[PDB]
Amino acid sequence: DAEQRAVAKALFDAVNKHLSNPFIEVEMRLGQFKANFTACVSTEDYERIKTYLMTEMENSSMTRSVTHDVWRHTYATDENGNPTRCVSIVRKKRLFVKNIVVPLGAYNLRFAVSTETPTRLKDRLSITDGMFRYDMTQVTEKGVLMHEVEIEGVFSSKQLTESWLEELLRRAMRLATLRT
């Protein structure tokens, strides 16, 4: 009856709260071997990858964000670069990691699949081309400045296909070999 419906609704809401919304992140990160794989590119190669992406872009769209990181707690920043407050808290567990065999002269590529479930400073610029998101991040994690580039997409319950993976590897190889 009516009381039963109130209990079941509460059980339903409590179940979903304990489920959360667990999505899957598939990413291909550029990097080098130089404590082995370092997910960074040179400054000059970084600016040329960006030149490539802005030339390629046609949707007149991008997102920039300066955040502070420290389960990871992400803190926003105001107009002067000072922290505001947490805008997200997420646990990232890597499920699958793989080194890609790249052509000679190319940047190395690391393939990573992670579950994300709702100190470093990140200045990130993100572009979308088709069903792929490009992230260009300048990271500082211990006084060291790293130029990071990755291509990625997120899935949950948007499902992952072999076609999307095939194009992800194609698009990543294009950035990895940009200088050659």
Binding site, annotated residues for Mn(2+): 25, 27, 150, 152
Burial class of residue 14 in the structure, from the number of CB atoms within 10 Å of its CB (0-12 exposed, 13-18 middle, 19+ buried)? exposed
Q: Which is nearer to Mn ion, 27 or 45 (CB)?
A: 27
Largest Cα separation within the chain, whole Å, is 71
- Least Cβ distance, residue 150 to Mn ion (angstroms): 5
Q: Which is nearer to Mn ion, 25 or 167 (CB)?
A: 25
DSSP conformation letters of 82-105: -EEEEEEEEEEEEEEEEEEP--TT
DSSP conformation letters of 15-51: HHHHH---EEEEEEEEEEE---EE--B-HHHHHHHHH
- Least Cβ distance, residue 6 to Mn ion (angstroms): 42
Nearest residue to Mn ion by CB is: 27
- Least Cβ distance, residue 180 to Mn ion (angstroms): 25
Stretch that binds Mn ion, among 24-32, 45-53, 72-80, 89-97 (CB under 5 A): 24-32
Q: Which is nearer to Mn ion, 72 or 179 (CB)?
A: 72
DSSP letter, residue 107 = P
Q: Which is nearer to Mn ion, 11 or 118 (CB)?
A: 118
CB distance 127 to 134 below 8 Å: yes
- Least Cβ distance, residue 137 to Mn ion (angstroms): 8
Residues 6+ apart with CB under 8 A from 148: 29, 30, 39, 40, 41, 135, 136, 137, 138, 139
Q: Count residues contacting Mn ion (CB under 5 A)?
A: 1
Applying the rule CB under 5 A, the residues between 26 and 85 that interact with Mn ion are 27
Stretch that binds Mn ion, among 9-17, 21-29, 52-60, 124-132 (CB under 5 A): 21-29
Q: Which is nearer to Mn ion, 17 or 64 (CB)?
A: 64
- Least Cβ distance, residue 95 to Mn ion (angstroms): 14
Residues that bind Mn ion (CB under 5 A): 27
